[PDB]
Design an enzyme around this catalytic site. Structure first.
Site, PDB file in Angstrom:
ATOM      1  N   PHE A  61       0.838  -1.187   0.000  1.00 48.03           N
ATOM      2  CA  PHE A  61       0.000   0.000   0.000  1.00 48.03           C
ATOM      3  C   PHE A  61       0.882   1.248   0.000  1.00 48.03           C
ATOM      4  CE2 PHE A  61      -4.604  -0.906   1.513  1.00 48.03           C
ATOM      5  CZ  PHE A  61      -4.853  -1.520   0.303  1.00 48.03           C
TER       6      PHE A  61
ATOM      7  N   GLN B  69     -12.323  12.182   6.960  1.00 46.63           N
ATOM      8  CA  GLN B  69     -11.434  11.820   5.865  1.00 46.63           C
ATOM      9  C   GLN B  69     -12.219  11.602   4.582  1.00 46.63           C
ATOM     10  OE1 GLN B  69      -9.011   7.932   5.808  1.00 46.63           O
ATOM     11  NE2 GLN B  69      -7.499   9.578   5.659  1.00 46.63           N
TER      12      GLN B  69
ATOM     13  N   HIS C  21     -12.122  10.133   0.956  1.00 45.02           N
ATOM     14  CA  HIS C  21     -11.399   9.165   0.134  1.00 45.02           C
ATOM     15  C   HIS C  21     -11.205   9.715  -1.274  1.00 45.02           C
ATOM     16  CE1 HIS C  21     -10.454   5.117  -1.614  1.00 45.02           C
ATOM     17  NE2 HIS C  21      -9.973   4.937  -0.399  1.00 45.02           N
TER      18      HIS C  21
ATOM     19  N   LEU D 161     -17.497   2.332  -3.687  1.00 45.30           N
ATOM     20  CA  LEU D 161     -16.056   2.438  -3.530  1.00 45.30           C
ATOM     21  C   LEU D 161     -15.333   1.343  -4.305  1.00 45.30           C
ATOM     22  CD1 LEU D 161     -13.675   3.712  -1.608  1.00 45.30           C
ATOM     23  CD2 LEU D 161     -13.942   1.549  -0.433  1.00 45.30           C
TER      24      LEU D 161
ATOM     25  N   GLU E 151      -8.116   0.869  -2.864  1.00 42.39           N
ATOM     26  CA  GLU E 151      -6.840   1.487  -3.188  1.00 42.39           C
ATOM     27  C   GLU E 151      -5.775   0.472  -3.569  1.00 42.39           C
ATOM     28  OE1 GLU E 151      -6.823   5.511  -0.559  1.00 42.39           O
ATOM     29  OE2 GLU E 151      -4.876   4.530  -0.790  1.00 42.39           O
TER      30      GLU E 151
ATOM     31  N   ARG F 157      -4.095  10.014   2.061  1.00 47.27           N
ATOM     32  CA  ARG F 157      -5.413  10.064   1.437  1.00 47.27           C
ATOM     33  C   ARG F 157      -6.011  11.456   1.317  1.00 47.27           C
ATOM     34  NH1 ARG F 157      -6.797   5.167   4.062  1.00 47.27           N
ATOM     35  NH2 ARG F 157      -7.197   3.458   2.582  1.00 47.27           N
TER      36      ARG F 157
ATOM     37  N   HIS G 205     -15.207   9.051   3.837  1.00 45.48           N
ATOM     38  CA  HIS G 205     -14.751   7.686   4.084  1.00 45.48           C
ATOM     39  C   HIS G 205     -14.718   7.312   5.560  1.00 45.48           C
ATOM     40  CE1 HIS G 205     -13.230   3.938   2.805  1.00 45.48           C
ATOM     41  NE2 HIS G 205     -11.974   4.118   3.168  1.00 45.48           N
TER      42      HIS G 205
ATOM     43  N   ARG H  51      -5.411   9.117   8.365  1.00 43.09           N
ATOM     44  CA  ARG H  51      -5.393   7.670   8.512  1.00 43.09           C
ATOM     45  C   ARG H  51      -4.574   7.033   7.391  1.00 43.09           C
ATOM     46  NH1 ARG H  51      -9.437   3.473   7.544  1.00 43.09           N
ATOM     47  NH2 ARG H  51      -9.442   4.531   5.519  1.00 43.09           N
TER      48      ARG H  51
HETATM   49  C1  LIG Z   1     -16.879   1.773   4.732  1.00 40.52           C
HETATM   50  C2  LIG Z   1     -15.542   1.195   4.357  1.00 40.52           C
HETATM   51  C3  LIG Z   1     -14.570   1.059   5.320  1.00 40.52           C
HETATM   52  C4  LIG Z   1     -13.311   0.517   5.022  1.00 40.52           C
HETATM   53  C5  LIG Z   1     -13.035   0.111   3.703  1.00 40.52           C
HETATM   54  C6  LIG Z   1     -14.031   0.261   2.724  1.00 40.52           C
HETATM   55  C7  LIG Z   1     -15.267   0.782   3.034  1.00 40.52           C
HETATM   56  C8  LIG Z   1     -16.316   0.921   1.965  1.00 40.52           C
HETATM   57  N1  LIG Z   1     -11.825  -0.415   3.327  1.00 40.52           N
HETATM   58  C9  LIG Z   1     -10.920  -0.546   4.260  1.00 40.52           C
HETATM   59  C10 LIG Z   1      -9.680  -1.089   3.922  1.00 40.52           C
HETATM   60  O1  LIG Z   1      -9.409  -1.448   2.789  1.00 40.52           O
HETATM   61  N2  LIG Z   1      -8.742  -1.210   4.908  1.00 40.52           N
HETATM   62  C11 LIG Z   1      -8.982  -0.822   6.167  1.00 40.52           C
HETATM   63  O2  LIG Z   1      -8.076  -0.968   6.978  1.00 40.52           O
HETATM   64  N3  LIG Z   1     -10.152  -0.295   6.539  1.00 40.52           N
HETATM   65  C12 LIG Z   1     -11.090  -0.162   5.633  1.00 40.52           C
HETATM   66  N4  LIG Z   1     -12.312   0.376   5.978  1.00 40.52           N
HETATM   67  C13 LIG Z   1     -12.565   0.791   7.369  1.00 40.52           C
HETATM   68  C14 LIG Z   1     -13.033  -0.360   8.229  1.00 40.52           C
HETATM   69  O3  LIG Z   1     -14.005  -1.092   7.519  1.00 40.52           O
HETATM   70  C15 LIG Z   1     -13.672   0.121   9.530  1.00 40.52           C
HETATM   71  O4  LIG Z   1     -12.710   0.829  10.270  1.00 40.52           O
HETATM   72  C16 LIG Z   1     -14.208  -1.031  10.376  1.00 40.52           C
HETATM   73  O5  LIG Z   1     -15.136  -1.766   9.583  1.00 40.52           O
HETATM   74  C17 LIG Z   1     -14.889  -0.578  11.648  1.00 40.52           C
HETATM   75  O6  LIG Z   1     -15.294  -1.743  12.421  1.00 40.52           O
HETATM   76  P1  LIG Z   1     -16.169  -1.551  13.745  1.00 40.52           P
HETATM   77  O7  LIG Z   1     -16.343  -2.851  14.441  1.00 40.52           O
HETATM   78  O8  LIG Z   1     -15.608  -0.417  14.521  1.00 40.52           O
HETATM   79  O9  LIG Z   1     -17.578  -1.111  13.137  1.00 40.52           O
HETATM   80  P2  LIG Z   1     -18.795  -1.844  12.408  1.00 40.52           P
HETATM   81  O10 LIG Z   1     -18.304  -3.125  11.841  1.00 40.52           O
HETATM   82  O11 LIG Z   1     -19.415  -0.865  11.478  1.00 40.52           O
HETATM   83  O12 LIG Z   1     -19.808  -2.136  13.609  1.00 40.52           O
HETATM   84  C18 LIG Z   1     -21.208  -2.237  13.273  1.00 40.52           C
HETATM   85  C19 LIG Z   1     -21.953  -2.995  14.344  1.00 40.52           C
HETATM   86  O13 LIG Z   1     -22.533  -2.063  15.286  1.00 40.52           O
HETATM   87  C20 LIG Z   1     -23.759  -2.572  15.744  1.00 40.52           C
HETATM   88  N5  LIG Z   1     -24.574  -1.455  16.182  1.00 40.52           N
HETATM   89  C21 LIG Z   1     -24.512  -0.174  15.723  1.00 40.52           C
HETATM   90  N6  LIG Z   1     -25.381   0.616  16.305  1.00 40.52           N
HETATM   91  C22 LIG Z   1     -26.059  -0.203  17.194  1.00 40.52           C
HETATM   92  C23 LIG Z   1     -27.104   0.038  18.101  1.00 40.52           C
HETATM   93  N7  LIG Z   1     -27.672   1.226  18.274  1.00 40.52           N
HETATM   94  N8  LIG Z   1     -27.545  -1.006  18.835  1.00 40.52           N
HETATM   95  C24 LIG Z   1     -26.969  -2.198  18.656  1.00 40.52           C
HETATM   96  N9  LIG Z   1     -25.985  -2.542  17.830  1.00 40.52           N
HETATM   97  C25 LIG Z   1     -25.569  -1.485  17.120  1.00 40.52           C
HETATM   98  C26 LIG Z   1     -24.353  -3.285  14.542  1.00 40.52           C
HETATM   99  O14 LIG Z   1     -25.231  -4.309  14.943  1.00 40.52           O
HETATM  100  C27 LIG Z   1     -23.120  -3.858  13.844  1.00 40.52           C
HETATM  101  O15 LIG Z   1     -22.951  -5.218  14.212  1.00 40.52           O
END
Ligand SMILES: *Cc1cc2c(cc1C)nc1c(=O)[nH]c(=O)nc-1n2C[C@H](O)[C@H](O)[C@H](O)COP(=O)(O)OP(=O)(O)OC[C@H]1O[C@@H](n2cnc3c(N)ncnc32)[C@H](O)[C@@H]1O
Ligand SMILES: CCCCCCCC/C=C\CCCCCCCC(=O)O[C@H](COC(=O)CCCCCCC/C=C/CCCCCCCC)COP(=O)(O)OCCN
Ligand SMILES: C=C(CN(C(=O)c1c(C(F)F)nn(C)c1F)C1CC1)c1ccc(Cl)cc1Cl
Ligand code: SF4
Ligand code: F3S
Ligand code: FES
Lengths: 235, 592, 131, 143
Positions: free
Chosen positions: B120, B241, B243, B253, B256, B287, B354, B400
């Site tokens: 990367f 951030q 993208h 998306l 990269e 980025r 992003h 980031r």
């Molecule tokens: C959006 C994105 C991010 C991304 C990426 C490409 C895209 C389109 N590509 C990446 C990459 O190539 N390399 C990398 O290092 N990171 C990349 N990212 C970022 C990465 O995906 C994020 O940093 C990561 O996914 C974050 O994980 P986290 O565990 O913090 O978050 P989540 O998976 O979104 O969690 C969602 C869960 O939350 C529960 N939830 C939410 N609100 C509630 C409420 N109110 N009550 C109960 N549960 C809740 C959901 O159920 C879900 O399970």
């Protein structure tokens, strides 16, 4: 000048439980709308009747939340494209032979209990002594291609007529493909006990090779050939 | 009218992403009674969309060193990250990718039998002066997809009571400490009270407060609004951030990795963005400079477009054999929403939102923080922890580096479970509280259900999205940030007249979208006030009226308070830590 | 047929329960797969040497065709009982439908014998019936 | 707790589970070649296996409770029993049910060696089944 296409969506309300389900008709202007079906379901909810309930999350086709039956076949609503001809109509249904919760929301509780029972985790007993990863070749890693990338949408299980009638005991084509992903893994040294859950009357031997499983998969995988190799490995 | 059900556990984890799943079975393999509350099924979270890799200094393609990886995370944040969490994350990174392979993650192999790792942007070896290094440790295009499906299958090996499809409403709080949560069963229509000793928030980021974003539909800020409604601050909310690549019109998306092995952004004249206008001598940089390369290219006229807001990315140079083995998930996601192949003609590109480098202020071991009102020092909140994207340890700081957000989930989800075992002993009686503990969160669920106004919940949602894209955007100044504060305050006073036309309590989806609008209005109103008060430019926040980076006066964080919607927002600051965990293992990196 | 009371809504419990699989009974599992492939592999070549025959077959070649046609027809009637009349929803009448596939196929084997020893074959009955 | 809170929540959920309907499965699904050419392989053997049983339980019932049946004795009762216009509606529909089961059982002997199971091979061994049936079934009438 607008172009009005007619949609026909399934409806049921659990606060009036004696009302029979029926199809309701909406008209969406196709000039100011997206090219997919989910972009026309989200406009009926915002600019019209807002009691229409369904599941959605990414709008890309990688989680598998918007599985329904659109126009006769099982597909995902964010990939299925609106036929740009306003002289025809469209019929949207839930997934077939499922107990519905509200409108297009099926109750997938039995589907998650059958997936827990195949033990989807690695079951080695020894690891290297220096603290490095366990080795695998390139020709053995190639054996896993096309199997680990199922998104668990159950669009193949709710198209199999053996799963329509016998689904409290038959595992379906979506769980029986993930049971094959762990059987041909070269690092998983627990193989004899993963073929003793399937050697009874109806857990594996209700597949009659109809093949609506491989025909309707939106990701292009082959769950009908993966059941033909478990039967050939138990013999 | 309501009936409440009482549970009783030891630890409660809110969220089932990559951080809430790693911390869940890390606590249940140690003898504790854990409950995981999730809104979706755990393999439908937003971390199934990741397509990059996990940076780790394994060193099986050349020589490597973990002190070289630390220098790139520190320099790439404009020296606002906490240097005692960079020293912890980049040291424990080789030990957590070999441990992640023993669960059954199908990593791509090398012809010796070892994990394959690619390049990367950002990672250069020999202390920032040398050729590009190779450490990304990728599965082909499904690194985020094959990491949820393995971490979820290992949570079934132990015992973890998943409460699937529950919507958490608020934190229970008694006398300055938290004692559990309160949720709402969507299938049944009940209210549940959970009681615990340590509750862990791993919900995720907020990205749907903007018009165009790469996030999911369920990426609202739900943990940041529970914390801000209890009287606790949020940190560094101004650093969003943008993208560089992302589909024109929808927001989808491409990864990269399309520029890691061969990639040209070709404008209307037909040049490569390598120098002479908006460029660093090297491409594949961080980025935001590349994002400030594209936005400065379109306005002066050097950009092809149907309305002249559009770009390209060439992929015709690559051989056809490498497009089916390295990036197979890219060739199918462009020929659906954009409708062109990756082998003959380039693909349209726009910059969209992003990532959020801000959230709950946290120590490096997982404990949530506040500040004292007498001396201004730090203070541990009793009972609360955080991890994931919703937390702000300041490992990323102001900018980031790519493929460091998947390492963020594993290292700081393993450190959360390790410091609970060193404090809390299993089996302990709970304190008897009043019988209406959490009665002000059901009085708000009743008001938003029997709502009658003039504006629907999908009409006030559009005045928030079009305001944040117009004012809090890539190019900022103190004449369009003051128009953003006066407009996002007027939108918040129209939430008093919302309109809801569904009075059911079984899958009332008209109520869940107007509960997620209350959470996004708290998170978006604190971003416009924080970004209009920092008079400098560093990282992903660029002020046109102050173009120089200031170090002697502005090397501090920002903490913001807001209790309810339509309430005043206040600000206080805290200093950034500039010393390592051990002065003999890795010395500190000075600014330059 | 009387129907046993079912589970309410098709399911019982929480998604963090599990399906408890039946014990290994490979006389109904893998060994039943062997019998269904031996009867099918020996009725496809034997019927092909009945469209290329001048008249009727010999009683050594016609008894071996008729006994391999009864087992091929038994194994598909066996597989329609266990799809439609199941022990989950009917109970006792899954076994009473499998005992009347007993002496309704043991009288059939006596009917093969009284065709082969006095008359000529089963194929000598259908060739003279016409088609 | 957590066992008193599991009985109380399964009382109102087992009450709501009993009033949910089932979504339609047939009569809404799309007609395809995968499940139309597979229902003609179960129908064709049930309609043929019943005739094979009834004509062998008749010779094996008349052995015990002896009536003395013979092949040329039942052949006159069947030939003389039906008119000319229904003699060819019975034999005209057993010729095509025999060719779709003889040519469909070779299609299944390939599919147990796990070959020809792609979507490109399910469709091209099903276009031979509609050509094998229309030629063998018409040649059997001229005999
Ligand atoms: C959006 C994105 C991010 C991304 C990426 C490409 C895209 C389109 N590509 C990446 C990459 O190539 N390399 C990398 O290092 N990171 C990349 N990212 C970022 C990465 O995906 C994020 O940093 C990561 O996914 C974050 O994980 P986290 O565990 O913090 O978050 P989540 O998976 O979104 O969690 C969602 C869960 O939350 C529960 N939830 C939410 N609100 C509630 C409420 N109110 N009550 C109960 N549960 C809740 C959901 O159920 C879900 O399970
Ligand atoms: C692989 C499928 C298995 C079928 C299971 C069903 C059980 C009974 C089925 C068939 C019985 C024996 C089949 C006889 C083979 C056909 C003989 C033939 O083709 O010759 C025709 C006779 O014409 C036919 O019989 C056409 C075949 C179709 C027969 C009926 C189809 C299904 C029969 C069901 C049985 C119902 C009751 C019939 C008698 C009861 C005893 C079986 C004319 O005679 P030749 O001139 O000598 O031929 C030589 C040409 N050079
Ligand atoms: C219309 C159908 C449905 N159907 C099946 O039931 C089926 C099944 C499965 F039910 F086990 N396995 N095989 C081989 C079949 F033909 C076919 C379409 C798939 C039908 C076809 C014939 C009969 Cl006698 C009864 C039915 Cl209702
Ligand atoms: S095999 Fe295909 S259709 Fe079946 S669950 Fe997986 S992705 Fe869905
Ligand atoms: S459609 Fe069904 S019958 Fe078998 S081949 Fe597929 S699981
Ligand atoms: S929304 Fe995730 S697949 Fe349709």
């Amino acid at each position: 000048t607008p172009r009005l296409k007619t949609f026909k969506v399934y409806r049921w309300n659990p606060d009036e439980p004696s009302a029979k389900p029926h199809l309701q008709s909406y008209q969406v202007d196709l000039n100011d709308c997206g090219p997919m079906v989910l972009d026309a379901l989200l406009k009926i909810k915002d600019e019209q009747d807002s009691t229409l309930t369904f599941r959605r999350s990414c709008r890309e086709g990688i989680c598998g939340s918007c599985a329904m039956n659109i126009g006769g076949r099982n597909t995902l609503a964010c990939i299925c494209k609106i036929d740009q001809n306003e002289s025809k109509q469209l019929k949207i249904y839930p997934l077939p032979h499922m107990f519905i919760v509200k409108d297009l929301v099926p109750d997938l509780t039995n589907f998650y209990q059958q997936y827990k029972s195949i033990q989807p985790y690695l079951q080695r007993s020894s690891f290297p002594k220096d603290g490095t990863e366990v080795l695998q070749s390139i020709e053995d890693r190639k054996k896993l291609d096309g199997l680990y990338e199922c998104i668990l949408c159950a669009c193949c299980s709710t198209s199999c007529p053996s799963y329509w009638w016998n689904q409290e005991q038959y595992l379906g084509p979506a769980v029986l493909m993930q049971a094959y992903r762990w059987l041909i893994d070269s690092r998983d040294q627990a193989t004899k006990t993963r073929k003793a859950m399937l050697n009874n009357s109806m857990s594996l031997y209700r597949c009659h090779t109809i093949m609506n499983c491989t025909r309707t998969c939106p990701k292009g995988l082959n769950p009908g050939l993966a059941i033909a190799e478990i039967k050939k490995s138990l013999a | 009218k309501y009936h409440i059900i009482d549970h009783e556990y030891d630890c409660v984890v809110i969220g089932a992403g990559g951080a809430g799943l790693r911390a869940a079975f890390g606590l249940a393999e140690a003898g504790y009674k854990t409950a995981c509350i999730s809104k979706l099924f755990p393999t439908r979270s937003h971390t199934v969309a990741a397509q990059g890799g996990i940076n780790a200094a394994l060193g099986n393609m050349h020589k490597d060193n973990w002190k070289w990886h630390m220098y790139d995370t520190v320099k790439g944040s404009d020296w606002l990250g906490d240097q005692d969490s960079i020293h912890y994350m980049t040291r424990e990174a080789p030990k957590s990718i070999i441990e992640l392979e023993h669960y059954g993650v199908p990593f791509s192999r090398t012809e010796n039998g070892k994990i394959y790792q690619r390049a990367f942007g950002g990672q250069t070896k020999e202390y920032g002066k040398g050729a590009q290094a190779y450490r990304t440790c990728a599965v082909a295009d499904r690194t985020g997809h094959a990491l949820l499906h393995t971490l979820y299958g290992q949570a079934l090996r132990h015992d973890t009571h998943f409460f699937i499809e529950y919507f958490a409403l608020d934190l229970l709080t008694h006398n300055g400490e938290v004692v559990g949560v309160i949720a709402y069963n969507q299938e049944d229509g009940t209210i549940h009270r959970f009681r615990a000793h340590k509750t862990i928030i791993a919900t995720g980021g907020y990205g749907r407060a903007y018009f165009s974003c790469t996030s999911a539909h369920t990426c609202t800020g739900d943990g940041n609004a529970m914390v801000s409604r209890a009287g606790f601050p949020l940190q560094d909310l101004e650093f969003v951030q943008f993208h560089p690549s992302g589909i024109y019109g929808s927001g989808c998306l491409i990864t990269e990795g399309a520029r890691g092995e061969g990639g040209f952004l070709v404008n209307s004249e037909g040049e490569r963005f390598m120098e002479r206008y908006a460029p660093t001598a090297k491409d594949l940089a961080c980025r935001d400079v590349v994002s400030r390369a594209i936005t400065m290219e379109i306005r002066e006229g050097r950009g092809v477009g149907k309305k002249k807001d559009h770009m390209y990315l060439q992929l015709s140079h690559l051989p056809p054999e490498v497009l089916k083995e390295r990036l197979p998930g890219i060739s199918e996601t462009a020929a659906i929403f954009a409708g062109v192949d990756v082998t003959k003609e380039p693909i349209p590109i726009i910059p969209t939102v992003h990532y959020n480098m801000g959230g709950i202020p946290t120590k490096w071991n997982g404990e949530a923080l506040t500040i004292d009102e007498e001396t201004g020092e730090d203070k541990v909140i009793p009972g609360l922890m955080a991890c994931g994207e919703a937390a702000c340890v300041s490992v990323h700081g102001a900018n980031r580096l790519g493929a460091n957000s998947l390492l963020d989930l594993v290292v700081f989800g393993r450190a959360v479970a390790h410091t609970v075992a060193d404090t809390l002993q299993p089996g302990l009686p709970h304190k008897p509280l009043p019988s209406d503990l959490g009665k002000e969160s059901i009085a708000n669920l009743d008001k938003l259900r029997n709502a009658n106004g003039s504006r629907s919940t999908a009409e006030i949602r559009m005045n928030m999205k079009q305001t944040m894209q117009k004012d809090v955007s890539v190019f900022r100044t103190q004449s369009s940030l003051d128009e953003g504060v006066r407009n996002i305050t007027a939108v918040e006073k129209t939430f008093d007249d919302v309109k809801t036309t569904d009075r059911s309590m079984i899958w009332n989806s008209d109520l869940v979208e107007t509960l997620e609008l209350q959470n996004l209005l708290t998170c978006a109103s604190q971003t416009a006030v924080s970004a209009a008060n920092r008079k400098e430019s560093r990282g992903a926040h660029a002020r046109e009226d102050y173009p120089n980076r200031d170090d002697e006066h502005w090397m501090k964080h920002t903490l913001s308070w807001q209790k309810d919607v339509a309430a005043p927002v206040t600000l206080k600051y805290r200093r950034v830590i500039d010393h390592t965990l051990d002065e003999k293992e890795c010395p500190s990196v000075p600014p330059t | 047929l009387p129907v046993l009371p079912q589970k309410p809504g098709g399911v019982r419990g929480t998604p963090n329960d599990a399906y408890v699989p039946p014990p290994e009974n490979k006389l109904e599992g893998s060994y039943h797969w062997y019998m269904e492939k031996i009867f099918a592999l020996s009725v496809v070549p034997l019927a092909t040497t009945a469209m290329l025959t001048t008249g009727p077959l010999s009683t050594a070649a016609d008894s071996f065709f008729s006994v391999m046609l009864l087992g091929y027809c038994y194994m598909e009637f066996n597989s329609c009982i266990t799809d439609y009349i199941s022990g989950r929803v009917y109970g006792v009448w899954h076994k009473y439908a499998m005992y009347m596939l007993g002496l309704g196929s043991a009288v059939s084997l006596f009917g093969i014998y009284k065709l082969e020893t006095e008359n000529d074959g089963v194929v000598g009955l259908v060739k003279s019936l016409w088609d | 707790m957590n066992t008193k809170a599991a009985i109380a929540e399964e009382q109102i959920l087992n009450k709501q589970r009993a009033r949910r309907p089932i979504s339609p499965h047939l009569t809404i699904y799309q007609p395809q070649l995968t499940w139309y050419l597979s229902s003609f392989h179960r129908i064709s053997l049930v309609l043929m296996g019943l005739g094979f049983y009834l004509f062998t339980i008749l010779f094996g019932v008349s052995g015990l409770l002896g009536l003395g049946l013979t092949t040329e004795k039942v052949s006159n009762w069947y030939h003389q029993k039906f008119s000319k216009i229904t003699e060819w509606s019975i034999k005209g529909s057993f010729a095509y049910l025999f060719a779709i089961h003889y040519g469909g059982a070779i299609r299944h002997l390939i599919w147990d060696t796990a070959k020809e199971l792609t979507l490109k091979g399910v469709y091209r061994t099903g276009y031979a089944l509609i050509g094998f049936t229309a030629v063998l079934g018409t040649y059997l009438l001229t005999l």
